Enzyme design. Sequence first.
Site, PDB file in Angstrom:
ATOM      1  N   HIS A  41       1.288  -1.561  -0.369  1.00  0.00           N
ATOM      2  CA  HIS A  41       0.087  -0.170   0.132  1.00  0.00           C
ATOM      3  C   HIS A  41       0.965   1.432  -0.158  1.00  0.00           C
ATOM      4  O   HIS A  41       0.135   2.621  -0.046  1.00  0.00           O
ATOM      5  CB  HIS A  41      -1.058   0.104   1.473  1.00  0.00           C
ATOM      6  CG  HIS A  41      -0.210  -0.317   2.589  1.00  0.00           C
ATOM      7  ND1 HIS A  41      -1.075  -1.205   3.386  1.00  0.00           N
ATOM      8  CD2 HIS A  41      -0.705   1.246   3.055  1.00  0.00           C
ATOM      9  CE1 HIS A  41       0.102  -0.385   4.653  1.00  0.00           C
ATOM     10  NE2 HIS A  41       0.003   0.723   4.725  1.00  0.00           N
ATOM     11  N   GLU A  72       1.017  -7.965   0.699  1.00  0.00           N
ATOM     12  CA  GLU A  72       1.025  -7.380   1.441  1.00  0.00           C
ATOM     13  C   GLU A  72       2.930  -7.037   1.069  1.00  0.00           C
ATOM     14  O   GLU A  72       2.845  -6.002   2.220  1.00  0.00           O
ATOM     15  CB  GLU A  72       0.145  -6.984   2.566  1.00  0.00           C
ATOM     16  CG  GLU A  72       0.053  -5.522   2.521  1.00  0.00           C
ATOM     17  CD  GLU A  72      -0.558  -4.722   1.701  1.00  0.00           C
ATOM     18  OE1 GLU A  72      -1.254  -4.946   0.591  1.00  0.00           O
ATOM     19  OE2 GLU A  72      -0.779  -3.758   1.805  1.00  0.00           O
ATOM     20  N   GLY A 146       1.050   4.938  11.048  1.00  0.00           N
ATOM     21  CA  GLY A 146       2.294   5.515  11.241  1.00  0.00           C
ATOM     22  C   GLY A 146       3.307   4.674  11.355  1.00  0.00           C
ATOM     23  O   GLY A 146       4.596   5.041  11.128  1.00  0.00           O
ATOM     24  N   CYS A 148       3.179   1.490   9.940  1.00  0.00           N
ATOM     25  CA  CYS A 148       3.403   0.169   8.184  1.00  0.00           C
ATOM     26  C   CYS A 148       5.166   0.526   8.243  1.00  0.00           C
ATOM     27  O   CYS A 148       5.743   2.080   8.137  1.00  0.00           O
ATOM     28  CB  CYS A 148       2.523   0.814   7.522  1.00  0.00           C
ATOM     29  SG  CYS A 148       0.866   1.320   8.130  1.00  0.00           S
TER      30      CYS A 148
END
Length: 182
Positions: A41, A72, A146, A148
């Site tokens: 992402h 992911e 924040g 990630c």
Amino acid sequence: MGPGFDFAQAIMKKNTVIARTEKGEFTMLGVYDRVAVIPTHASVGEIIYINDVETRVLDACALRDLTDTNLEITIVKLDRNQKFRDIRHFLPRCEDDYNDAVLSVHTSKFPNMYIPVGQVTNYGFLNLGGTPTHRILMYNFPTRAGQCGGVVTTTGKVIGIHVGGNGAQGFAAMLLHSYFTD
């Protein structure tokens, strides 16, 4: 404070950079040579900022399992003038549960941040932001925006990168040795 935090600190000090895309600032784990990982992402493009330096992306691959399900993880190769310490021998070979994990973050917003998250479940399937995702690790800690790209470690292993949360639980994508065979 103890040997968990010691291992986490050794990985953060030598094997992380701050990555900036049009989607934000992320903790980025360098794995070997000029190869690093980031949550998919982050939407990596042809150019990325690495410690606030403009950097060409030589390759980027958003990983999916053999059922064509999102994992992911994006593997990025950076046009950087310096290699990472090779940490592939710290990656687990198979999907697993863990005791006593640490989540470590390093950004402009959260510098030198370490969180003892405790027990990590092999959760498996997660609907992550509406996207069916596999190989998800879960820890019962209310991780926030924040964090990630945050590195999840145990003593002796680098097991995943933080990719989301539901306000009570946090979720990480597995890192496996087989992703980084060259």
